[model samples]
Target: KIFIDPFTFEDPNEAVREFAKEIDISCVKIEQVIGAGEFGEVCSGHLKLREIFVAIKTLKSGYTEKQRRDFLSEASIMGQFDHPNVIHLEGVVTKSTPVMIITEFMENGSLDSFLRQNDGQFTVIQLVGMLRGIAAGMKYLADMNYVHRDLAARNILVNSNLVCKVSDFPIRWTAPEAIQYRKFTSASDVWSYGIVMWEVMSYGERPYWDMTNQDVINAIEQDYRLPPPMDCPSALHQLMLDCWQKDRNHRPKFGQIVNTLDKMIRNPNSLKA
Candidate 1:
């Protein structure tokens, strides 16, 4: 394993660039490159560092000045978090013309990809495992008071064993004091998470596929919601609906969500697969 000497932080940009150059890419082999919705491209790679796999994403430099600053700031904030469900940032390249963030790779790709490939193959137990992982991640984010603005399936990656790690924080909601006075509270994340649950149950269906973003926002304001998942048990359906309620204040906290999902998982007969 090639270990890069940790760079001292005098200048953020210089530190990131030096950190990237110090790490040996020879031991990290790229498998495939995947593109996200106007966000960036992520490359699946295997790392010899402790024989673990990793994902490295190069942000598009074409972003507006404000967007670039936001992205860099987000990366800096992510460096403070250490959690299993949240994607682990191994290193970053900041000195270059375009910045790149490296994280642990999920071999199975996004949750949507996993569900599509294993549709009808997962049992209730396996589904619960994935759900728990997601809930755990949400709990971590909530605990830190960081809200993920985009929490859809495309932002969530899954390992081969179905373990989930939340990713894509460049556009995450920042605290009111952090940026443009926008607040990223737990309630906001809960709202985003409800949509994630919907995507998971629907086998990664696009959120508001039939409507434009403006229309979806209008519908949401009017209390419109996606119907319960087809063939889902009553308990799961009810829980999901409760999470996606129009009133943001009505949504359950991540702690409550974790407890509820734990119950559903522990009691197999409590819900249908």
Candidate 2:
């Protein structure tokens, strides 16, 4: 598998040309709209190539140069990574009128919705297994010196087999430092991971419940952290707390998180909730 660190690229356009595969727009047939965002609509479709199903993200027609570049940026980053827990990018259709990004179709959809749909059904071990998959994915990105600015349950996609893969690449979930000074680092990702842990343990409950953006910022500045979700195991809650430490330096690395989850999985008793 090829690993191209984005930080090493002085010219991002060059990286895109080198990493992302090009495909004809005619090859994709849109089946259904999966989601919509500022960029445009993300749809599930069938790629004529090998008759495989895929997810297609389209850039709305009449998009400016900047919007077009921003839309394809995720494809450039995803095209380089080859990890089971990371979403797979199939190809892009930049030569067409409506630009499109093709990727593997996730049958179960986003992790947050998946968990909410099956709330109170998963065993503690099963939940931890999901977290393990996410952590391993983060570890892979970390090893490549890539920081996922938006690491949250909503950004993680699950497939038919309950395999979790990290998705949504272009920076929305900001770290404290990032919000204040626009700085992003691996440490910031750890903080976001803590929030994700809360989401998973709480069965997709919204973090900071109904709080405004300013409130969240103020609370974090004052060292406010969310309490454990109902019946969350002590060990797991403690790990979440570590990830939320005011000092990012104290947050556990993704590798450490992976190891801790593996240990809990092996012992089983440590997963008590």
Candidate 3:
């Protein structure tokens, strides 16, 4: 029984132990392994009780205590946020063997690779909707003082219905200040969001294609911003530039970003400029 909100806990490990909902291992049946994850194998499984498909992250044998702690740390973080765009955690099985971390199955996989595969299929408005969803999710996290230090399209997970869930240096996507001084704040996240916006407009194109990390950092230091993607709206690109502002203080906050995206959605013709 969760007597206190996990967000109130200063220690993440303590939060996870206290906050995580323990599920019976027998209830979860693994159907197939989708991919390898940081801690172990990620799979698509069936939760027999709910009769719903779920994604399960299973820990491999020989995983260290630190790995177990680190693995559950993600759960502790995801356990707190309950937004539509953020990926939802189903529960965890810690007392039993395998120590699984289960979440809602995203049939479509990751956003960046998905968009790249189905290039030119989305309208400007559709793409904007995806960006807006991501921004809203980030805003929710930002308000909680949780910095998504590695925000990017690849980190975004999409479902078959096209609803996105933010699940990277993400060096190419990292903010200028973060790169220079190792400080990660919501403003740094805004800079990363600019790169994400560019990726979406470009149909999941790589940022600074073929450029080395040194080159990217050097370019940002020299005030070089990424060019707008093909068919990108001027207003959208302007927002991107605003996000990439050299001064971290000058970057628009995620709330402002959500509002700006909402404004753009309300008036599609504004994209023409």
Candidate 4:
């Protein structure tokens, strides 16, 4: 372990390199692999002397230029966001062999998976609380005028607090305009948020269950939307429908959703019949 400072490899995406700090790999120690990422293994690790627990995502050694850049693409995208509900990007290890993205570890891992683990166990108020945290993150992204490419329960991370963090999507949760014209906005993401709401309420049931991507897209074209998840609150269901409004203009802003969530939290009666 030597004194390794921030060093940018003469590399792929300038944005990631620009936003992410180059971490000293010497202090980092990769432990067991916990989950598989779109790129490679995601592991639980610690920083040597500090012994800080963190999550480490690696760029496989065999990756070509495309894979390397694409893997870091997530690093680049997330490095810019900073909300409590947004995963913290600790840094990136570029000078080391097989690039790495290190970030704050969420013990509970993906929101959807955790929800499945405790399926039907939490109260609707607790579920609404989780949704509020996620909506708050979405509000931040929307206020920044950034559009998240994918937004769903699975992409979000959860910790002991059951806090939901928007980690980053595709077809099942995508909005109609997004499908037809590649026109994505905060509104489109709001549509996805509604789908995520369904996922949360149902404790992580797959959206458009058993439906193919084409079926989802076709259903959207025909003005079809997901049915309410079992036992979902009437008010909560209405809020999700507000988010799924066909016209992007008609959808409530993320900020409004947060406000609505806050209200629901304030009055549990709002989630009841």
Candidate 5:
């Protein structure tokens, strides 16, 4: 359960050599652009080896060494994980220009967009189920000592089965200490998870709507947490508050989150708004 980050090694080249799998770029067929990211364009495509649909994240034609290293870091981290609730990395293309990282395609796209498209279409149980899937994924990462600095609804992808998978690992979603001092830990991830819970309950509402970055920092310093979303169940809201605790040590672990959600699922009486 102790999964160390390969990128943390003194020799990053050795780390990449140990974890990266090289795949030919030609084997991937890019269909269309799905989105854009800091790396470059993200496309939906098919890998010829498996003849299966996949999402391909591409780097720009001209990229610096730092950009290349950062792009491959995600693949290295993702390749180590094996969970249904986590996005599956197929392989990477490093032998050619415009490096690409291949991963399984989520038909439903991001959780926030999916929820917005089908707003008010799900029951309380279904919403909780999505949260359960996300929590299960987070727990797996937590047990592996991987702190997902970004754990938000926009970063979560959903498959056709409504299964939620955590995605997008940017340093920006980092917890306060990590943001202020560049120190990341599981406790920091718990804080991000609380914001994600608020997103889920609000059905894709923006966290701290219209608040400037300084305002959010100032508010958190004052121990001012977000109020519960309209019609959010009291029990679920309480859990969100627990996650937002000022002391990171007091926040519930992902294991506890999974267990609590499971208990709520078993006892539907508490699912009421």
Candidate 6:
């Protein structure tokens, strides 16, 4: 296992190159770069050996040591899981001044953009497929005793066929065991999945829209959830609400969600068109 200590780097690009060199891997050929709020930026690159595409996320400069450690810990945990719906960690290049985490390349970008290009609507069958995929991924994580602290639409990527794959772990909250021993409980992931369902139903709308993070947190504390995604069936709305219950114990488990979605998909009569 290769671990890179967090340090200040003048250039993010240089940091990535140096880290790759230490691993004895060819440099990443940058194609396009995308930023995720204040966390860091993701760069699409072509891996020279397998001639396959990959992504490298370099931690933003000026983060505290704790922040760097948290990011590194998440990377370590991600290194352990291998599932279709969960992005795969190819390698970690941490020998450089600033670290770069590499993962499989998601050609279709994020679920948000995928829906935007597809008219913000998906067939019931298609939605079920996405739900099943996400649940399967969550099951794997839960089995490993890790929770994806942040499971939202923006964090999920969609391929050409609209298959959803969860990505972009919330570093601060999804660290490894040594950091704070905060494991991702099945209930916590269920909460996130409910929010993800909302995102799916709303055609990829922002989680809280104009509401501040504190407002959303307060509302959730009071047993409130974002209104059901626009045009969602009543049953689906109720299920989403149940998943977001204030008490984590009350949230439906991933296994339950998978079964429910499977039944809904098999019976067209259950979902009103």
lDDT of 5 by residue, 1-273 (tens): 466576678865555555567778778899999999888999998998749999999999778988888888888778878898999988888878778898999999999888878877888899899999999999999888888877888989999889999887433244667678877788888878888888888888778888878888888778778898878889998998888777778989999999999999999998775
Clashing pairs in 1: 54-105
Shift of residue 126 alpha carbon in model 1, Å: 2.2
Best by TM-score: 3
Candidate 2 lDDT score at position 31 = 92
lDDT for each residue of candidate 4 in 1-273, tens digit (9 for 90 to 100): 111112234554676677778888887899889978888888999965457889999987788888877777677767877889889988888888879989888999998999999999998888998999999988987776667868998899998888889885178898888888999889999999999999999899999889999998888878887888899988888998898888999999998999999998888887777
Task: Report the lDDT tens digits of candidate 2 across residue range 140-230.
Answer: 9988888888899989999988889999871324578777787778788988888888899999988888888888888878878888899
- In model 6, where do residues sit more than 4 Å from their true spots? 1-23, 36-40, 59-70, 95-99, 170-184, 212-225
Model 3 alpha-carbon miss at residue 149, Å: 0.6
Q: Which residue ranges in model 5 land beyond 4 Å of their true spot?
A: 170-182
lDDT per residue (tens digit) for residues 1-273 in model 1: 122212235554543444333245455566778665344666767666577777766668677755554555445555656788987777665555445666777788878777877766776667667767887887887777666666667778888667888887622211112223454457666766766776677676666666776576566557677677666667876777777655567778888988998998788889854
lDDT of all predictions, in order shown?
0.66, 0.86, 0.87, 0.85, 0.84, 0.67
RMSD of each: 6.2, 2.6, 2.8, 4.8, 2.2, 6.8
CA error at residue 66 for candidate 2, angstroms: 1.6
Which scores higher on lDDT, 2 or 5?
Answer: 2
Candidate 3 residue pairs that clash: none
Q: Give the per-residue lDDT of model 3 (tens digit) for 175-204.
A: 877877899998999999999999999988
Tens digit per residue, CA lDDT, model 6, 1-273: 222322344443343344333332455565778655345777888766457788877777887766666665546556556788888777666666446677778777888666666654568668768878988888777776665677777788876666788776532112122123554566867867877777777776777787775566565556566776766877787888878666667778887888888888888678784
Global local distance difference test of model 1: 0.66
Higher-scoring candidate on TM-score, 1 or 3: 3
